[PDB]
Symmetry: D2
Subunit: 387 residues, 4 copies
């Protein structure tokens, strides 16, 4: 059996809500810790964190709230990031929920966000600052706008957790400006740009790269309801703000157009390299429906954005995807990651049979760097009951 869930033996979950969430996701998270090749102390250490801070935050077990972050809508999903031979890392995307979420007292779920954010500040966490994130929230609050609004997707922020191989967690926060933009009847990008600009006199290090993205977005009508924003919980210097968006139907040409941001960054050799490898997968993988997602990461020092795409897998035979996914690793030359992948997939879902499963894996992310190589992460069915 899988190990880290040994802690619960001498723990009593206060509410029935929590007990049911534990039963729904407890084992599953323990398995990803195992599949993440984490040190046994670290496994229990993050297991500890999961129980105390995330299980309370899931809210009522029979969940009444759909979270924007998941295809299915439940407030959590688990991620594995694969690297060049180093190993794999585990990722959690979170949207705090309570019984008030979606109700008269909090129809758009701001309350749990601020609650959870104080738990985290209470925990003695390395390099944990909130100002930048506070800034974006303030930029997107509502008030009397709620009243307008009350007369789709309702969540207004989200969280992310990266458990690095060291026993350290890194906290990632999201912001969904669709609500704020819709209430003011102002195009999303106009306030996104103005939101980015408002931090520019605060420090003008994102102007170049962003204005470079905002131009391509306005060219291509890339901005839409689905566009949203991201950031890290740390000192501004080391912070990486990210802009996400989606497109309903996308061809390879459109993908190349976006990956090169029009033609903005054909000059950089990295992108050209990154785009080549990308079509190798595009061919493996796909060889009313879910959209494809894109990402532009604005490291502050640099002059260009770094792209990243998210590719729908739910709807594709999770075995075909495991197979093709493994073929692509040999092409890159990852010895252990490609050989033991599909065995690692069944060991996460022993109840299910990959031969016939489709929803078990939902997204794949692609990034490329000269230094790192090929970033790539897989997003999974993150509960233990499958329809």
């Amino acid at each position: 059996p899988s190990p880290a869930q040994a802690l619960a033996s001498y723990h009593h979950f206060p509410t029935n809500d929590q007990e049911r969430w534990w039963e729904e996701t407890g084992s599953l998270f323990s398995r990803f810790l195992e599949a993440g090749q984490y040190g046994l102390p670290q496994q229990y250490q993050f297991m500890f964190f999961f129980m105390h801070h995330l299980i309370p935050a899931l809210g009522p077990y029979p969940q009444k709230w759909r979270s924007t972050i998941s295809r299915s809508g439940l407030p959590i999903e688990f991620s594995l990031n694969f690297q060049k031979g180093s190993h794999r890392l585990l990722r959690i995307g979170f949207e705090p929920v309570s019984f008030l979420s979606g109700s008269s007292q909090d129809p758009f779920n701001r309350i749990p966000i601020t609650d959870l954010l104080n738990r985290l500040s209470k925990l003695q966490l390395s390099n944990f600052d909130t100002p930048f994130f506070q800034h974006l929230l303030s930029k997107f609050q509502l008030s009397l706008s709620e009243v307008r609004q009350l007369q789709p997707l309702k969540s207004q922020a989200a969280f992310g957790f990266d458990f690095n191989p060291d026993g350290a967690i890194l906290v990632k926060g999201y912001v969904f400006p669709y609500l704020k933009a819709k209430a003011a009847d102002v195009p999303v990008g106009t306030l996104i740009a103005e939101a980015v600009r408002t931090i520019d006199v605060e420090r003008n290090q994102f102007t170049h790269a962003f204005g470079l993205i905002n131009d391509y977005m306005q060219e291509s009508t890339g901005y839409n309801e689905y566009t949203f924003l991201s950031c890290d919980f740390v000192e501004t210097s080391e912070q990486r703000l990210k802009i996400y968006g989606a497109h309903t139907e996308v061809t390879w040409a459109k993908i190349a157009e976006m990956w090169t941001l029009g033609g903005r960054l054909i000059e950089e050799p990295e992108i050209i390299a990154g785009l080549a490898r990308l079509k190798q997968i595009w061919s493996l993988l796909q060889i009313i429906a879910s959209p494809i997602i894109w990402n532009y990461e604005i490291h502050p020092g640099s002059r260009f954005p770094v792209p990243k795409f998210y590719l729908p897998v739910h709807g594709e035979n999770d075995l075909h995807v495991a197979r093709a996914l493994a073929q692509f690793w040999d092409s890159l030359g990852w010895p252990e990651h490609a050989c033991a992948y599909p065995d690692t997939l069944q060991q996460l879902y022993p109840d299910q049979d990959i031969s016939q499963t489709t929803r078990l894996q939902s997204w794949i992310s692609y990034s490329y760097t000269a230094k790192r190589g090929v970033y790539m992460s897989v997003y999974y069915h993150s509960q233990s009951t499958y329809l």
Copy 2:
């Protein structure tokens, strides 16, 4: 005996810290409820509120933290506002505290502020929006600044509670920009002005009145470490932002100079009348030391600010102050407040003998309106142990 503290009979305070605060301020608060002439249901209604939300927030009973708001430093003080015959209202100024306050984990006591701010949002309160207050906080966070700072008065925010005669509480928030200003080596007003301006594109209704004050402050070197800011927790339309300040030594001419903001607002007839009554008290009252405080209230629609002063009484025989205080009510012609005041003062401090007491009563506020008449509020010794 006084009534409203009957609730405590069948209530158990969880920590020893809370129990000791109840013993220190519980009866006293019950008495102010009485002296405010509140409906008995409302007394228990606000008494309920006091126990659940404010007693937890006071922190360690032997308090480790000095709050900026009080002369003595304790995180609470009670106010009575007297009106033209209508009656009196009760006011509480609050700074949440915990055992972490002043420690490495939160050396400047930001954590309790955001905690309490979520309790209030969870309570179903009429007309309660946080965006404006959130905006100012974001404008004054610190992060790496803490580390510089760690190498006076430390608080960054505070709360205010107005209990109107109806069973409704109104929430007032404060902000102390001295910290943010000291870390960035930027004069307070420049970021105050820039802080106000940042809300001007957000809505430019404070520009005229504020720029009108900021000119006088820069004329007179009025800005100082002690300058801070205020506002209300409601819709921007009905919100009244306030700038406070202090002066070490001040003459009547200095008072007149300030009340008329230099000469900015001699045009308004209101000011001249209000100043007239004001000297009427100045003469009664005063007829290394504590400073005198001023306030400029920027109602958004209007074109001028409304002044308000705060007058030191701690150090003056609290009976002499009661006597002089009541004479001034007849001059105004308030039949009942002036006749039954000093009896109302002793009934708040039956343990003490006003003949010899000095610290029981600490500040007096003065505002004047054509419509309202004479605003005036008294700030008291708000614990039950007197040195």
Copy 3:
């Protein structure tokens, strides 16, 4: 509207479960406080107690547990005790519950009992000792017996609350020995007797009166599964232990037989008088089904038990019951109690129409004393949703 529920305005019920109970029983409890003619401070004072200690203890709102105490099974019911002209008193029967109640971890609901019993010991309550009640609990625990039993009515204990006109609560505790007896395959009385005897060397003041009851119980086959036990939470001197039981079918002669405990206490003149009045009601009231209940109260100093009967009213037109119930008050000569009763009945149930109602009032209790006169209490539909 009814008053005491004004407290909830500035209170947030932590769980969804509690919120739903408040909505279900909150208004109703406020009305019984009103209908009890309690001083307005005391109303809020007991209303305070109800919110903090009883609402948490009700457990899941869609209740998973049937309580033995109620005909319907819900863990609470309200009582009014009518006296000779003095006034009326409010009574609550309680069984604490949690989501664990009825589960593997606590299949017979012992856990909630002990939790609530500590809350109460924490409250500073006058004349509150637990030794006597603990004694009965110890005598009726299970352990390995639970396992046997897992292979009807399941509860092992319950609470009762008397709110006297003074701001003081008196706590009444119950015990249901059917389980312990069924596990040990021992007739209930033999261990009940041995339970009473175990306190006899502890103090032999109940021997005479009890042995007097145990004989009649063995004569008439009175003991049965439904027999259970009661007591008060105070000093042994002032404690009144009671034995209850039931009979499926009962005639007047059986009633007379039981009231005079066979012939055990025909000698006492009180009994004869009390029995006379009793038939006066039996005639008014009744002029697969619910049983009739009896009670024998063993005051320690005295030598005889005092009886008490409980009469099914659910199934009787609650108006017919009100009319006849009030006629009987004139017979005794209670001026105000008899005139304003049925108006007091509708004012408790304005949503319902007494002309058509049957379940609104369920039991009537009868005791007689030379000193007190006629004890008599009414048991009501104690939730706000009626089927």
Copy 4:
């Protein structure tokens, strides 16, 4: 560094009291887990338990209450039990405390006892029944006796925790009858005997062995204020009730007199063997002051009690004690325990230097069985600040 305290990194202790207890005993417990040779999963597993249930129960950090269990009075002490080559086990003796302990509301510290006992019952613990222990508590409660008493050692109960090598805890409970006996002005043994007898009709399996002990105790005037009682939290069949006591001054002959319980059990060969070894230690060890303690364990099935003694070591050079203690292990022929002990002792107290320390180890327990061999346990300085 020592490992198990890694859990604290991502946990925030709610109160300052808890934080200070963590800082005072947290590392030390982590080290005993290490010194017990527990599986790393089990270490964290018990570490989890220690943090959630025992740190809360210690009460105010600057402790206001003296616990009967410890020489110094602090409510906790850690034990190591050494066996024949199998390994060692870790033991914790606990007395729950709160800020109410010793106050008017609970002058003899009963409330924390019942609270902790409910946490434990909520935990799904193997073979956890409370009936036997509840029986003893009820036999020793007070009520009006409290008031008498208010007009030494005050605690009435305590807990013990055995962490077996498997990830399972066994709960041991204590009871201190001196208070109940002092109240009723009745000698301790009479009610202890009557207490044991009351469980005899409940099951008469302890009669023979106990009546066998009660005779020697009233022969030798062995009963005294210090006499108290113990038991296990499980099914009566597997329960081992124990009687403890003390003697001010004791010679070897007295020890032989006590070990052989007068002459009651010279017939048994075990005792004679056990006593031989015992003098072997007495000579090694000792070769206004603390008393020496004895224990008689009444396994229900058997016909004789098994003794156990406790020998004062605090006051003896803890290195001399380690040396002599280790020599005795070779005499028995325990290879690894004897070679690496004093290295194991310094590794528990690296801050201290055994050359000069005296209080680091406080008691040694000795038991003998034919089957087990030589039971023997050491009781240590169980906080991290040494005077």
